[PDB]
Amino acid sequence: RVDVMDVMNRLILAMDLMNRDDALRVTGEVREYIDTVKIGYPLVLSEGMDIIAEFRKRFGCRIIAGFKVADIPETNEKICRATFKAGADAIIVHGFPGADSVRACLNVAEEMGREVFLLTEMSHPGAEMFIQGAADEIARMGVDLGVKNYVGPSTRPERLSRLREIIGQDSFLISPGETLRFADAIIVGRSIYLADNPAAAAAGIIESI
Amino acid sequence: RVDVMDVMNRLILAMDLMNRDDALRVTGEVREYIDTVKIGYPLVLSEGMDIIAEFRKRFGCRIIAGFKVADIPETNEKICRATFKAGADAIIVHGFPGADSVRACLNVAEEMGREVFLLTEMSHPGAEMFIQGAADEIARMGVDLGVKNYVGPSTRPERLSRLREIIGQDSFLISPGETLRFADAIIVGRSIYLADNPAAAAAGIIESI
């Protein structure tokens, strides 16, 4: 869809390394396979938010801040503004804190011309306690608020299908082969940056697509 | 109790200002009324994590990182280690993501000799959608995992009483008058740092204790 972002090769690199040198080095090794990188708190808190602008300038890539914002409205607003001011193209936000906390983020993204991704569900074991049960309602809340970008789990294909059903075919969905039957792009981390050779690892993944 | 932290005047300053100069200036104006300060992402993302060590050295205060960590276990571990390495004495973590995500934090705090505060419930309007309904279970999860420090709402005292009932009289509880009947310490922000004179504002609050 013309109004949703285009992720090269439908592959997003989750750059979870905490060392600036390593993060930039490994990303450089696979720069030809991706144009979108997700950066989280581990790297940003260890090296500073300036690392976001460094990635955009060194690789000409889109940066998604995988912060999973989950604070009160006023604080969410401040976190989003600081993150977008640092150059992030998009930010990932939790939906469990409610609609006002999500809208606070949407307001800033609108103002600054950036994007908000709503995290509807997580896949780690502990997600079963409260997150799994609220997933459908969180996705629906996003749809009702005009959210266009979503993050959903990949571990269970049928769950990604359910999410796609709720958000519709128009929405943009990313998830951490069959996954791409429902998601627009997949997020890969360790499988690439920890492999003996990240390039071959990334190349292999894309070939499967 | 002797095994729980002692917060001077039972008052914790929520330093939410995003400007280093202002945050340090206003904190300096009220330094005589508190020995514990809560710092969040707005300030840290805007000025860098080094600001935590700067506060501890300039004021000799305890720093609680009000990050409300809500990621997967591996990432929570990394966020906690980075935050504690930066000097934070404690970190606030969400319980909605489940037990493994909380334990990941507990592991790092144990290793580094720091503290974890479990956020059981929030008070902003949107909290009623999913957070309010999971609060009791989250508090019980904390108790079952040996969590000693908790953060609860202050808007509704009967809710604070319920939380105190679940965590017991031995647990340490902080909440953002009657509040101190159940909470060990109160967290005050805007009322202090935004007031015409934060010193008089802080002094007034304490006098009521």
JSON list of N, CA, C and O in Angstrom, two decimals, chain A residues 149-175:
[
{"chain": "A", "resi": 149, "resn": "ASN", "atom": "N", "xyz": [0.17, 1.11, 12.04]},
{"chain": "A", "resi": 149, "resn": "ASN", "atom": "CA", "xyz": [1.31, 0.20, 12.19]},
{"chain": "A", "resi": 149, "resn": "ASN", "atom": "C", "xyz": [1.22, -0.63, 13.46]},
{"chain": "A", "resi": 149, "resn": "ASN", "atom": "O", "xyz": [0.96, -0.10, 14.53]},
{"chain": "A", "resi": 150, "resn": "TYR", "atom": "N", "xyz": [1.47, -1.93, 13.32]},
{"chain": "A", "resi": 150, "resn": "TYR", "atom": "CA", "xyz": [1.38, -2.87, 14.44]},
{"chain": "A", "resi": 150, "resn": "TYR", "atom": "C", "xyz": [2.55, -3.84, 14.52]},
{"chain": "A", "resi": 150, "resn": "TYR", "atom": "O", "xyz": [3.20, -4.14, 13.52]},
{"chain": "A", "resi": 151, "resn": "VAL", "atom": "N", "xyz": [2.78, -4.34, 15.73]},
{"chain": "A", "resi": 151, "resn": "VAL", "atom": "CA", "xyz": [3.81, -5.34, 15.98]},
{"chain": "A", "resi": 151, "resn": "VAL", "atom": "C", "xyz": [3.10, -6.52, 16.64]},
{"chain": "A", "resi": 151, "resn": "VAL", "atom": "O", "xyz": [2.41, -6.36, 17.65]},
{"chain": "A", "resi": 152, "resn": "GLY", "atom": "N", "xyz": [3.25, -7.70, 16.05]},
{"chain": "A", "resi": 152, "resn": "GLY", "atom": "CA", "xyz": [2.62, -8.89, 16.60]},
{"chain": "A", "resi": 152, "resn": "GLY", "atom": "C", "xyz": [3.61, -10.04, 16.66]},
{"chain": "A", "resi": 152, "resn": "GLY", "atom": "O", "xyz": [4.64, -10.00, 15.98]},
{"chain": "A", "resi": 153, "resn": "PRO", "atom": "N", "xyz": [3.34, -11.08, 17.46]},
{"chain": "A", "resi": 153, "resn": "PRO", "atom": "CA", "xyz": [4.25, -12.22, 17.58]},
{"chain": "A", "resi": 153, "resn": "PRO", "atom": "C", "xyz": [4.24, -13.14, 16.35]},
{"chain": "A", "resi": 153, "resn": "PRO", "atom": "O", "xyz": [3.29, -13.11, 15.56]},
{"chain": "A", "resi": 154, "resn": "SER", "atom": "N", "xyz": [5.29, -13.94, 16.20]},
{"chain": "A", "resi": 154, "resn": "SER", "atom": "CA", "xyz": [5.40, -14.86, 15.07]},
{"chain": "A", "resi": 154, "resn": "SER", "atom": "C", "xyz": [5.33, -16.32, 15.50]},
{"chain": "A", "resi": 154, "resn": "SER", "atom": "O", "xyz": [5.01, -17.19, 14.69]},
{"chain": "A", "resi": 155, "resn": "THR", "atom": "N", "xyz": [5.64, -16.58, 16.77]},
{"chain": "A", "resi": 155, "resn": "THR", "atom": "CA", "xyz": [5.63, -17.94, 17.31]},
{"chain": "A", "resi": 155, "resn": "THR", "atom": "C", "xyz": [4.39, -18.76, 16.95]},
{"chain": "A", "resi": 155, "resn": "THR", "atom": "O", "xyz": [4.49, -19.97, 16.72]},
{"chain": "A", "resi": 156, "resn": "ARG", "atom": "N", "xyz": [3.24, -18.11, 16.90]},
{"chain": "A", "resi": 156, "resn": "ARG", "atom": "CA", "xyz": [1.99, -18.80, 16.56]},
{"chain": "A", "resi": 156, "resn": "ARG", "atom": "C", "xyz": [1.33, -18.17, 15.34]},
{"chain": "A", "resi": 156, "resn": "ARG", "atom": "O", "xyz": [0.69, -17.13, 15.45]},
{"chain": "A", "resi": 157, "resn": "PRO", "atom": "N", "xyz": [1.49, -18.80, 14.17]},
{"chain": "A", "resi": 157, "resn": "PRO", "atom": "CA", "xyz": [0.91, -18.30, 12.91]},
{"chain": "A", "resi": 157, "resn": "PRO", "atom": "C", "xyz": [-0.57, -17.93, 13.00]},
{"chain": "A", "resi": 157, "resn": "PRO", "atom": "O", "xyz": [-0.98, -16.87, 12.52]},
{"chain": "A", "resi": 158, "resn": "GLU", "atom": "N", "xyz": [-1.37, -18.80, 13.62]},
{"chain": "A", "resi": 158, "resn": "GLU", "atom": "CA", "xyz": [-2.80, -18.55, 13.75]},
{"chain": "A", "resi": 158, "resn": "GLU", "atom": "C", "xyz": [-3.09, -17.29, 14.56]},
{"chain": "A", "resi": 158, "resn": "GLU", "atom": "O", "xyz": [-4.16, -16.69, 14.40]},
{"chain": "A", "resi": 159, "resn": "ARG", "atom": "N", "xyz": [-2.17, -16.89, 15.42]},
{"chain": "A", "resi": 159, "resn": "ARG", "atom": "CA", "xyz": [-2.36, -15.68, 16.21]},
{"chain": "A", "resi": 159, "resn": "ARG", "atom": "C", "xyz": [-2.08, -14.45, 15.35]},
{"chain": "A", "resi": 159, "resn": "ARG", "atom": "O", "xyz": [-2.71, -13.40, 15.53]},
{"chain": "A", "resi": 160, "resn": "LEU", "atom": "N", "xyz": [-1.13, -14.59, 14.43]},
{"chain": "A", "resi": 160, "resn": "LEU", "atom": "CA", "xyz": [-0.78, -13.49, 13.54]},
{"chain": "A", "resi": 160, "resn": "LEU", "atom": "C", "xyz": [-1.92, -13.31, 12.55]},
{"chain": "A", "resi": 160, "resn": "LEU", "atom": "O", "xyz": [-2.22, -12.19, 12.13]},
{"chain": "A", "resi": 161, "resn": "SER", "atom": "N", "xyz": [-2.56, -14.42, 12.19]},
{"chain": "A", "resi": 161, "resn": "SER", "atom": "CA", "xyz": [-3.69, -14.40, 11.26]},
{"chain": "A", "resi": 161, "resn": "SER", "atom": "C", "xyz": [-4.87, -13.68, 11.92]},
{"chain": "A", "resi": 161, "resn": "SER", "atom": "O", "xyz": [-5.59, -12.91, 11.28]},
{"chain": "A", "resi": 162, "resn": "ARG", "atom": "N", "xyz": [-5.07, -13.95, 13.21]},
{"chain": "A", "resi": 162, "resn": "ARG", "atom": "CA", "xyz": [-6.14, -13.32, 13.97]},
{"chain": "A", "resi": 162, "resn": "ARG", "atom": "C", "xyz": [-5.91, -11.82, 14.04]},
{"chain": "A", "resi": 162, "resn": "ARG", "atom": "O", "xyz": [-6.83, -11.02, 13.87]},
{"chain": "A", "resi": 163, "resn": "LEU", "atom": "N", "xyz": [-4.66, -11.43, 14.29]},
{"chain": "A", "resi": 163, "resn": "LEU", "atom": "CA", "xyz": [-4.30, -10.02, 14.38]},
{"chain": "A", "resi": 163, "resn": "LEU", "atom": "C", "xyz": [-4.58, -9.34, 13.05]},
{"chain": "A", "resi": 163, "resn": "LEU", "atom": "O", "xyz": [-5.18, -8.26, 13.01]},
{"chain": "A", "resi": 164, "resn": "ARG", "atom": "N", "xyz": [-4.14, -9.96, 11.96]},
{"chain": "A", "resi": 164, "resn": "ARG", "atom": "CA", "xyz": [-4.34, -9.40, 10.63]},
{"chain": "A", "resi": 164, "resn": "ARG", "atom": "C", "xyz": [-5.83, -9.23, 10.35]},
{"chain": "A", "resi": 164, "resn": "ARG", "atom": "O", "xyz": [-6.24, -8.27, 9.71]},
{"chain": "A", "resi": 165, "resn": "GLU", "atom": "N", "xyz": [-6.63, -10.17, 10.84]},
{"chain": "A", "resi": 165, "resn": "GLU", "atom": "CA", "xyz": [-8.08, -10.11, 10.65]},
{"chain": "A", "resi": 165, "resn": "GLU", "atom": "C", "xyz": [-8.64, -8.86, 11.33]},
{"chain": "A", "resi": 165, "resn": "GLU", "atom": "O", "xyz": [-9.48, -8.16, 10.76]},
{"chain": "A", "resi": 166, "resn": "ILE", "atom": "N", "xyz": [-8.16, -8.57, 12.53]},
{"chain": "A", "resi": 166, "resn": "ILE", "atom": "CA", "xyz": [-8.62, -7.41, 13.29]},
{"chain": "A", "resi": 166, "resn": "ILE", "atom": "C", "xyz": [-8.18, -6.08, 12.70]},
{"chain": "A", "resi": 166, "resn": "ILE", "atom": "O", "xyz": [-8.98, -5.16, 12.55]},
{"chain": "A", "resi": 167, "resn": "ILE", "atom": "N", "xyz": [-6.90, -5.97, 12.34]},
{"chain": "A", "resi": 167, "resn": "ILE", "atom": "CA", "xyz": [-6.38, -4.72, 11.80]},
{"chain": "A", "resi": 167, "resn": "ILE", "atom": "C", "xyz": [-6.65, -4.52, 10.31]},
{"chain": "A", "resi": 167, "resn": "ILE", "atom": "O", "xyz": [-6.48, -3.41, 9.79]},
{"chain": "A", "resi": 168, "resn": "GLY", "atom": "N", "xyz": [-7.08, -5.57, 9.63]},
{"chain": "A", "resi": 168, "resn": "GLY", "atom": "CA", "xyz": [-7.37, -5.45, 8.21]},
{"chain": "A", "resi": 168, "resn": "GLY", "atom": "C", "xyz": [-6.15, -5.58, 7.32]},
{"chain": "A", "resi": 168, "resn": "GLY", "atom": "O", "xyz": [-5.02, -5.53, 7.80]},
{"chain": "A", "resi": 169, "resn": "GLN", "atom": "N", "xyz": [-6.38, -5.72, 6.02]},
{"chain": "A", "resi": 169, "resn": "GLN", "atom": "CA", "xyz": [-5.30, -5.87, 5.05]},
{"chain": "A", "resi": 169, "resn": "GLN", "atom": "C", "xyz": [-4.54, -4.58, 4.79]},
{"chain": "A", "resi": 169, "resn": "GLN", "atom": "O", "xyz": [-3.41, -4.60, 4.31]},
{"chain": "A", "resi": 170, "resn": "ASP", "atom": "N", "xyz": [-5.16, -3.44, 5.11]},
{"chain": "A", "resi": 170, "resn": "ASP", "atom": "CA", "xyz": [-4.55, -2.14, 4.88]},
{"chain": "A", "resi": 170, "resn": "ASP", "atom": "C", "xyz": [-3.45, -1.78, 5.88]},
{"chain": "A", "resi": 170, "resn": "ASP", "atom": "O", "xyz": [-2.48, -1.11, 5.52]},
{"chain": "A", "resi": 171, "resn": "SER", "atom": "N", "xyz": [-3.61, -2.21, 7.12]},
{"chain": "A", "resi": 171, "resn": "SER", "atom": "CA", "xyz": [-2.64, -1.92, 8.17]},
{"chain": "A", "resi": 171, "resn": "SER", "atom": "C", "xyz": [-1.27, -2.53, 7.89]},
{"chain": "A", "resi": 171, "resn": "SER", "atom": "O", "xyz": [-1.15, -3.52, 7.17]},
{"chain": "A", "resi": 172, "resn": "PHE", "atom": "N", "xyz": [-0.23, -1.91, 8.45]},
{"chain": "A", "resi": 172, "resn": "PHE", "atom": "CA", "xyz": [1.14, -2.39, 8.30]},
{"chain": "A", "resi": 172, "resn": "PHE", "atom": "C", "xyz": [1.46, -3.21, 9.54]},
{"chain": "A", "resi": 172, "resn": "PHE", "atom": "O", "xyz": [1.30, -2.75, 10.67]},
{"chain": "A", "resi": 173, "resn": "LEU", "atom": "N", "xyz": [1.93, -4.44, 9.32]},
{"chain": "A", "resi": 173, "resn": "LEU", "atom": "CA", "xyz": [2.23, -5.35, 10.42]},
{"chain": "A", "resi": 173, "resn": "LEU", "atom": "C", "xyz": [3.62, -5.95, 10.36]},
{"chain": "A", "resi": 173, "resn": "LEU", "atom": "O", "xyz": [4.02, -6.49, 9.33]},
{"chain": "A", "resi": 174, "resn": "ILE", "atom": "N", "xyz": [4.37, -5.84, 11.45]},
{"chain": "A", "resi": 174, "resn": "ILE", "atom": "CA", "xyz": [5.70, -6.43, 11.48]},
{"chain": "A", "resi": 174, "resn": "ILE", "atom": "C", "xyz": [5.72, -7.41, 12.65]},
{"chain": "A", "resi": 174, "resn": "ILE", "atom": "O", "xyz": [5.01, -7.24, 13.64]},
{"chain": "A", "resi": 175, "resn": "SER", "atom": "N", "xyz": [6.50, -8.48, 12.50]},
{"chain": "A", "resi": 175, "resn": "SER", "atom": "CA", "xyz": [6.58, -9.51, 13.52]},
{"chain": "A", "resi": 175, "resn": "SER", "atom": "C", "xyz": [8.00, -10.02, 13.71]},
{"chain": "A", "resi": 175, "resn": "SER", "atom": "O", "xyz": [8.71, -10.23, 12.74]}
]
